């Protein structure tokens, strides 16, 4: 039933007695459900060290991964180029998923096409799909560039992207001059971040490999910035802002911040902003190239060093205090521009906030996950805050990266109780937060189910989620946030300390029981 | 707009295309004539999508794993192949259920074989067998396993049927191989069919010779309701207030046992014709169980459906039918009285999958709204046959609409509201057109039944009449 | 007892059994405490409509006020001037409190002096305190200006500030040319906002009243901006940022943003930034003067209109969409500068966020409080979001203001269930959130005790607090936030919608009970 | 630094001042000599503050309402006068209690008469009478009322004593008039004395003729512990493990009845001498109850205090004393073993109110730290007498220190840690000096007793050794 002036959606409608009774009858009549005592028994077992050890012995089963597949990253990379249509050669089901995944995180349109290869292409390959697809895409959506990646069908069948694109041009489906950079992006190798690296290196090759003869390193007086797979708008923005404040000439290569934040003013803008084709063509003339997320830009790095002859500096992601300092100092060295008074003051404001909030942060224990560069930067900043990053999970991490993070942990007393996990998933993480309970999780929206599981054991075992990463689907507009630079550090610090204080307020809200410590001032 | 204006709109839009695409797309766009009973005279459907045109369609895996199998709550569904498909479809569809997740129910979890290069080169059947043992160890209360094939499985020549047979016999467990690779078919649709045939071949016959279930003359199953935001529950309640016993829900909040008990029912009630007509026809053929289509969107269709269903039973059910109708009468009347004046005359364009583009029209009309354009991602001509009589004369119909077409149609038609999916939502909001998600219900619902109609009305009103829509133009320009 | 590895602070130390037993024995032995049944009975009665009626008939008793006293506002105004020392003539106890109040909100030093009048001054007045106080303050802290206000002792005794300052200069205690603007700031008239108005008008008079003969309206081509009592750093910053983006010449009169946000770089800076004396002296040459918070700048307005001859525009506080639009359009008209593309895009990004989040905001009910201009801007923006601001409390509001807010409520259907309360306090508001329960409160840290009270009745009656206003003492760094302009609207929107979603996640976190609606995507 | 260097520092700092302020401030600054027993030869205290110099002091209302009366949990305390004083002091001091706030306890609430102009011009006595009736109606479980006078009350000639007597008799209610107006005295100190005399005159004698209390030989009261972060509870626990019965706590977590029962005890245990010596002397004079000063900061002082207290009773209590000491020995030894190596040799400067600037020195020394400067806002020479023997030779002492002085002393002395208040905290952090709040415990504590020492040690370590302090200098400057 409904009362018209207070209509109930599913919650709390289905808590009405009639619905409750109905659901009980469905269960008892037809579901042959395990008894509640058995459900409780098994649940309790899944929180144990015994279960954890079985869980960590998995070789074949993955449960609740913390990674996605290559072409997702290729699409994101492509979106950052001016009037560029991402195009995934292969199966259309993939593109519906890539678009929806990003739609839900950014709350924005996400434009991407497929060439709709079907079962029939297993005999003859996807050449005709490429020919008609490129022609159709160019005519219908009027991009100035089409950036081509692949789905796993196309990789398994073995379609030669290069030959297919060349033949599309030769047979007149698109003009010779129309830019069609490409990358093979197999979903069964690496992860979404690898797809970004592959796509970017493909675009870089397209615009520069055959035109190197006229290039002089340093001649355009700029620094190239390659952001990698990045889903916070504030991160593209903060890097541009800091470089502008410093008077440093730069080119941000892959910059989707305009197309992922168009105004609602009565028109839909399929394309906005982005890195220009000329910025890619002219990039070898830069003083150097800086990689913001080096642990998923290794292929890009080899091309930039081997072909552009740029001496790519050894810089960590610019997250936290020390690594933002190091980034700015290196940029100063490369450009000849001093670090300006404005950034020095901003730095000191971050340090002020650290001094103000250190007492609530000290010794707080975190479980966290994400992509390799994000995770190591978060780990570094947590150590700077006097926090303990006890469970560090990077599903798509590698052994070399893990060694690097282990060394960072060894450099600080706050790393003593920390372990780094690679190739492990959120079902593994779930066990760790039961058996070695931290104070909080820092992760993406898939963490909410771990919080739910921990509360079910009891309020005293609940591990609240702090949402930082990708994807965040269950809060609005957190994609506008910043994690890089002093600005990002100030945002992360504020989020962490207030999450701590919110939880403490919850635990001390009990009248005459715990509210002796429900302080007005903290 | 007149028929002539709509025909010229179609022609102007199609001018952008190269010749091959133009000629194809012309066959998938039509101006409705409700006199037509054979839609194969007026529109083509269920064909391949043209490359490069930004179809909104998904794949057979979405139709099998995402749609039919994934909701079955006490089984574990393996997304078998590389990591992408299972991650993008993890908890994206609001197929609601009651259970203890990770313990006896598994719907919002993502189980996968996370294929790596060595699995592609040498095959994944050994990995699948090991994966099954690991599932059994870590999730002992699962009541069955399905294997949802992603693109590489068939392409590399893996034999998941053999693995399912062998491991099923070893463990005395129902393990269902589903060949729903996204290279198959042209859309989600073939996934439904594949998934239905897998239920038939591996699950539905388990209790054929078992007569322990105590049947009544009023036993029914809800076939093709995936319980989006609780839709099946707000339908079930009405059927049982009418005196029927709902033995099974296929597959929203569904259990493997209720699927296995379905061949014992007296009548299959089909909501989603597109996705589950196959198994409904099978059950009539094999078990002699009749089936009937129904519609629980809005009071007019819900009342008509309750009466048509009750007419298949005796006077006692027909009497309870009228008792149910009398109970809810003042409730939906209050909804109409409040919201119809706020929505009267407003025009809506829809684009959804295989059912809702026709099924929700009645609900809109119960609020005085007019559906001026509708279409489907993956419908067949039998869906279009059912649509032409539901739509007004000279309205616009689109099959497998392209992004370009949908935008250009909206620009000319200027609907007051659009009802479509997540890939559509943010485009149309930026154009200043109120938008409601008509797959996910925009995180609201249920929309089925009398209780659902209240929420549907609230939702269309909150969005169409929201103050934000008057603010898109800056007062200085 | 303590375990050295896991030391317990008060929470949860005093939940140890030995402490629990001790506290039970203290109660039973010596406290002669009312029986728990009686406490429960009285608690339940305090949640009733019967109790609310009695509560609202109060004439003499105030409980949990939502206002402070005049000199607090005078001190904040004074801090916004370059190298200026706030100086409160009267009792020193007051100044300890003013500084600590602001210390806790900004987590920053707050410098202010007293001249330490004692009982003896009741015979003879505070003249000697002023003489020595001004001399001592100038020599010791080296300000370029001392801005004088009063405590209530000095008002009751009737000290003539003007004569006292003039005699201090006549007798050589400070140089004749040294700026000593003043304002009488009685705590028993109006509130802290009135102190700000009085202080500002005193400073404006000091620098302009005697030099009007050479002034020509519009000759410097700037607009003066008077911000009023403002405790969000982001608000000073956004106004300056928007005017700079427009290319509008301006002078922000009282700007404490630098002195309330100095870097932690190894030195203490008693003074930083601020409005210059030269800006105050030149202010009458502006095109016009815009008041950001007109409902507590009425004295300032009369001086600016009557003496400077500026036709102060009738603008509301620039909060929400419409009032930010109006502000920018009026600034455009006065300055002749068009509204630039950057601000047009920002506006459209706010509107985009509104379209994205409207379904969770729609029909949500709020109780809220604060100063008059802040409250009316919040009400307006809430109506713009399709929310219902049902309990609007402004302790320091007036009848004319209430009529203006009632008019705003009348212009929207979302105002139909709203009532505006003036002269009422947070004990009044407590009753309203029990008897006519909203979904949330928007208010300052004093609201936490109301949330605590509502939870004690039951989880289903709990009204969560969303912290926006002054003071906020129990979270860190929220003073950095913004409430004005499109940026402020974006911040408020995000805070509101995510407060809603946080609560929904709490309510749907119950395993097998309410988690059917624990959606990954919202 | 040597004596001559500290002397030089004092003269250098004093150079900034005009002659009158210079001559005054010189009398309030001294180099410690622990051979001195008469501090009146070395330092002047409890005088007026010099105008314009940024004293850190508060007023008599803070000392009465904020400090002595406000913590009493089951009474309602009216901040009588304009709105400022009650609002700034609302819940700023962490005087912890167990109760149901707004129902039977009222500590964190702000009750005020919110004086307006008409109250100043015509008097507030009628408003106070009406206010009392409104309190009784809305807060019926209150067990008494205090009237905390703010500046205007005495200045305008109001008679709160008459109102208290008349309304008290009418309502059979303890209503206490407190003349703690901020114009009185020079600091918080006179507020203590005024407050003690009000307890004496209006509360303490209520049960003088009542013989119903079941007394024991081991009855004590804790006098002058305001339970900051639970300090009185972590002291109480030890006294009762030693076999004593704590009849009252003045006034942290204090009730009116336990104040009224205090004349029935055998011994008054005085922690805060400055605030409560007045009533302790009164109770010895009138009731013959002895009193003794003690110190529960750190293990050395706590052990000494427990033994000295036990010595006042019989062998059974002295036996329990040694049992308590043995119980906690491994606990505090573990704290010292963990934290003393992290803090050994570090130098601290303190500035606090009237007790803690001397009382915490032993706790610092138990962690190997050195207190190189200390001072008080409002101490009297009897406090300085007790201080000079606790401080090292040639250390710096400051009475009513000015902001300028404190900053300049710190610049030269370069302590590793500063312990002071909220108005000092952020100044010294910006200078790169670790700071701990030694009034509010920086929202931590308790610090009293054995359990408190663990938290104290943890806190000094977390702050002094925090990684933030190595980061204030940008690597490019
Ligand atoms: S039609 Fe899968 S998302 Fe693709 S590139 Fe392969 S991992 Fe990644 Fe359908 S079954 Fe899936 S969703 Fe596509 S691959 Fe095929
Ligand atoms: S010494 Fe009160 S804060 Fe003042 S201006 Fe009057 S309202 Fe405001 Fe002490 S008793 Fe109080 S705190 Fe001062 S006034 Fe006196
Ligand atoms: Cl889950
Ligand atoms: Cl309170
Ligand atoms: Fe958006
Ligand atoms: Fe600070
Ligand atoms: Se899960
Ligand atoms: Se309260």
Numbering used by the authors:
A (entry chain D), C (entry chain B): 2 to 523
B (entry chain C), D (entry chain A): 4 to 480
Provide the publication's sentences verbatim.
The reduction of substrates by nitrogenase entails multiple cycles of association and dissociation between two component proteins for sequential transfer of electrons. In the transient complex, electrons are transferred from the [4Fe:4S]-cluster of the homodimeric Fe-protein to the MoFe-protein in a reaction requiring adenosine triphosphate (ATP) hydrolysis. The MoFe-protein, an (αβ)2 tetramer, contains two types of unique metal centers per catalytic αβ-unit: the P-cluster [8Fe:7S] and the FeMo-cofactor [7Fe:9S:C:Mo]-R-homocitrate. The P-cluster is the initial electron acceptor with subsequent transfer to the FeMo-cofactor, one of the most elaborate metalloclusters found in nature and the catalytic center of biological nitrogen reduction.
Se, a structural surrogate for S in [Fe:S] clusters, has crystallographic and spectroscopic properties that make it an excellent probe, hence, potential Se containing compounds were investigated. By screening a range of experimental parameters, we found that Se from SeCN- could be incorporated into the FeMo-cofactor by incubating nitrogenase under assay (turnover) conditions with concentrations of SeCN- sufficient to inhibit acetylene reduction. The 1.60 Å resolution crystal structure of Av1 (Av1-Se2B), isolated from assays containing SeCN-, revealed that Se quantitatively replaced belt-S position S2B in the FeMo-cofactor thereby generating the [7Fe:8S:1Se:Mo:C]-R-homocitrate cluster (FeMoSe-cofactor) form of the MoFe-protein. Significantly, Av1-Se2B retains acetylene and dinitrogen reduction activity when compared to native Av1, with the difference that the activity time course for Av1-Se2B with acetylene and dinitrogen exhibits a longer initial lag phase than for native Av1. Consequently, the ability to prepare site-specifically labeled FeMoSe-cofactor provided the starting point for a structural investigation of the active site during substrate (acetylene) turnover. (A) Side view of FeMoSe-cofactor ([7Fe:8S:1Se:Mo:C]-R-homocitrate) in Av1-Se2B at a resolution of 1.60 Å, highlighting the S2B replacement by Se. The 2Fo-Fc density at the Se2B site is significantly increased compared to the S5A and S3A sites.
